[PDB]
Design a binder for this molecule. Structure first.
Ligand SMILES: NC(=O)C1=CN([C@@H]2O[C@H](COP(=O)(O)OP(=O)(O)OC[C@H]3O[C@@H](n4cnc5c(N)ncnc54)[C@H](OP(=O)(O)O)[C@@H]3O)[C@@H](O)[C@H]2O)C=CC1
Ligand SMILES: NC(=O)C1=CN([C@@H]2O[C@H](COP(=O)(O)OP(=O)(O)OC[C@H]3O[C@@H](n4cnc5c(N)ncnc54)[C@H](OP(=O)(O)O)[C@@H]3O)[C@@H](O)[C@H]2O)C=CC1
Lengths: 453, 453
């Protein structure tokens, strides 16, 4: 159901009525009318409204963070960072969007020949609960700067976040119908994708959700962008700064209570450093503070939902039954709220299903390898291909990791992070298309070739 | 069935056995092995092989053209041009591909941060009979320059063309498995899209074919590019060079026996010049030479298949029964082969079904409008959105047409043409994604973000 259920206490706080198909239709009609006027606005107006939205996010950061924490359990401090990052991407496209969409001229026999960039129309965004502000602003800032309008189907467990994003954009000055939150369930999305006024769609979330949306959009001849999770490797080689790698690796696995597409999920350790690294990782994980995410000292809040908790509990239980060893954690906490402790699994047997799954919780799989070829093969031995992190100060190793890791992003001597300045997206079953950077504003526009005699 | 059936005579010339699923699987296994080595080739090698392919096309142009004309009925002269254009796109990506794929650096706190471009792997291309060389080389040249490998499912009526393309690429030096023609039917494509080694797919053709491929690819989380039909407007306003517009419009509608996605299909005439333009168009169409496409004097050969002939015959018959008037032509010729004459329809009743359909034959629909707003509204009143041509020497009108015509390409005072130097693709039900230019080589690559501390 569409509801705020606080994952720290399990309390149902507020329920929301889903829109009916007629109500969805009315919102799409309004979006179409809004688009016809909005496509004619100047970049100066769009820039003003985007910068206003950034300023709202920058002023009321703590309030917005409290909504996120209440609904989905990420620490209030990380939710503050998320609101700040949302403001950053608004400012990024305010500052660069017009330039990024300017005519590009190519010399031909024409007096004038160029490509110009024009909005498609209504874009559908289907978004997940894990970064309930950032994922939305990541899409919405370039969408709106480009002159598109947007309808958001957010996750059913973050309705207050979804409503707050629309309220921010209204307060910023964006005209009515330019951005609309649809309080609707997963079964209601098909109507939106099939509506002739809706021109494109993006989804961030699970593979089954992405497959459903993309198959439907494909049938309707509509372009998509998908970002669908990962099982990113975190490779540590003998020339690495081991203490930095342990600290950063701990953050990479456990940030957002582990619920990140680009969490470090599989630690691949060269045998020369594996014992030292693993012992340090074990101790670092054991010192993490688990508790109320509203408290500034908390490292690990609850998982977002009972379902996520049930999923990881089963995944771990099955791996252990198959022969995997629990170095730390491995069982849900006996307390109120959907709490699962930082966990480290080792000696996972070959062929165990968990090797191919995404662990959306603070649960690290650990492996040892003997050389560069083995590290790369293991790193790539997954259906996903989102991010990858590798730690080494040998230039030849650095170049091989960069070249041969099958991922949309490769970070050397740092954790994978998204950044408005650089494109971001997956390969393989992690999806396709790129958000952020120039790519983010070029994805859902008509690149119109113009030739004038 | 997979066969050469000469559309000039109706004679079945050669039949081909379709691959079995096991044979398809073997070809995909070989493509995967080939990709593992081919992705490691230098741009110099890829460039050499692409330039070799161009040189083969440039030398044996008449022979390749004869294959096209025999299988699908386009004039030998236009097939010569098609082989030349195929060579041109090979040279374009040989000359620019490396530059187009070079690292793009972005300043951050990283010592090094950039995007690099790497091939995805096996690409499936599903191609149509209407430009049986050019459509293939348009995709294959950038695919191969980027380090991808490709499997081609060509139309069932151009098997000799399909085999010839593979033979050209073998003779050029491309390693075995880098490009493979699959002699398979439409029902066999699902196996290819669902194969885990196949990473992306492109289709040019009809909407139902595109919807099938894209829906399947979406379910498998695989990116696509679609170029489907169009019903492109050809708008003529009072300041136009009328005689040039008539000459060029006649070519635009009747080239390739009318069977082009970017044919001028709907002539939209300002009332001030409509009588003169229509009379001149009538005269030009009336004296086009219909006959054997191997003869150098022939303008119009047969349509490619009995099915295409049946389709246009029915479309025109229904429009006329509804009240449309035949100014010229309007029924299949009484002779051997799938011949349909240049045809002009006027006074088409509002709500007539034909107004929304693609006429893939040399059949012009003609309309009269009173002003700029009416021209734009009528031009856009279709499900398609591929190309658009407008004729005016008023700068304000030119800019409004460029801005407001809902198409992937807008040509002012010339006919729409694809050109390797400029991206090419549709909007609305005409598809999405861009081939040619920079876009063509960026579509099916992993844009990998790299960050080095
Ligand atoms: N890439 C990422 O960042 C994320 C990945 N995931 C992965 O997915 C797993 C399960 O999480 P879960 O919360 O169930 O993720 P979902 O994929 O179910 O949710 C993501 C979004 O998709 C919507 N959705 C779900 N099914 C469909 C459908 N058939 N058509 C249209 N929209 C749909 C959801 O709506 P509703 O809430 O109404 O069901 C939500 O808005 C996680 O453990 C993680 O592995 C999940 C979240 C973030
Ligand atoms: N955009 C363009 O340039 C073209 C558009 N068209 C439009 O389509 C109309 C019909 O022409 P037609 O020859 O039937 O075109 P199709 O769309 O049937 O054929 C195009 C290609 O798609 C293949 N194909 C067809 N159905 C499927 C499917 N379900 N899955 C995978 N591949 C498939 C065909 O294979 P096979 O031959 O084995 O069926 C062929 O290789 C034309 O009148 C024109 O309007 C057609 C050709 C060119």
């Amino acid at each position: 159901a569409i509801a705020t259920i606080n994952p720290t206490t399990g309390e149902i706080c507020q329920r929301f009525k889903a829109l009916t198909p007629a109500e969805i239709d009315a919102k799409l009609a309004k979006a179409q009318e809004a688009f016809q006027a909005y496509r004619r606005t100047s970049f100066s107006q769009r820039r003003q409204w985007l910068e206003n939205a950034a300023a709202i996010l920058e002023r009321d950061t703590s309030k917005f963070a409290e909504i996120m924490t209440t609904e989905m359990g990420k620490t209030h401090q990380s939710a503050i960072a998320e609101a700040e990052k949302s403001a950053l991407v608004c400012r990024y496209y305010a500052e660069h969007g017009e330039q990024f969409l300017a005519n590009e001229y190519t010399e031909t026999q024409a007096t004038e020949s160029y490509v110009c960039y024009q909005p498609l129309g209504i874009l559908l965004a289907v978004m997940p609960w894990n970064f309930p502000f950032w994922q939305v602003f990541r899409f919405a800032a370039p969408a709106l700067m480009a002159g598109n309008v947007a309808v958001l189907k957010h996750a059913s467990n973050v309705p207050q976040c979804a409503l707050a994003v629309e309220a921010i954009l209204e307060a910023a000055g964006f005209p009515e119908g330019v951005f609309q939150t649809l309080l609707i369930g997963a079964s209601q999305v098909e109507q939106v994708i099939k509506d002739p006024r809706v021109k494109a769609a993006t989804l961030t979330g699970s593979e089954p959700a992405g497959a459903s949306l993309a198959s439907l959009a494909g049938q309707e001849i509509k372009p998509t962008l998908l970002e669908l999770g990962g099982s990113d490797p975190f490779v540590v080689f003998p020339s690495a700064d081991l203490d930095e790698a342990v600290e950063v690796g701990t953050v990479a696995r456990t940030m957002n209570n582990g619920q990140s597409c680009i969490a470090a999920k599989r630690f691949i350790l060269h045998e020369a450093i594996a014992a030292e690294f693993l012992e340090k990782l074990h101790l670092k994980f054991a010192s993490l503070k688990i508790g109320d995410p509203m408290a500034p000292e908390t490292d690990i809040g609850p998982l977002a939902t009972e379902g996520i908790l049930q999923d990881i509990s089963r995944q771990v239980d099955q791996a252990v039954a198959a022969g995997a060893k629990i170095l730390l954690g491995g069982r849900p906490l006996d307390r109120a709220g959907y709490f699962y402790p930082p966990t480290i699994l080792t000696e996972i047997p070959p062929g165990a299903k968990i090797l191919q799954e995404e662990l959306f919780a603070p649960v690290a799989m650990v492996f040892t390898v003997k050389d560069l070829d083995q590290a790369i093969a293991l790193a790539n031995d997954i259906p996903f291909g989102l991010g990858a992190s590798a730690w080494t100060n040998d230039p030849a190793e650095q170049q091989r990791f960069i070249q041969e890791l099958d991922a949309g992003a490769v970070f050397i001597n740092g954790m994978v992070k998204s950044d408005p300045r650089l494109p971001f997206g997956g390969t393989k079953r992690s999806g396709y298309g790129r958000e952020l950077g120039l790519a983010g504003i070029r994805t859902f526009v008509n690149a119109k070739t113009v030739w004038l005699k």
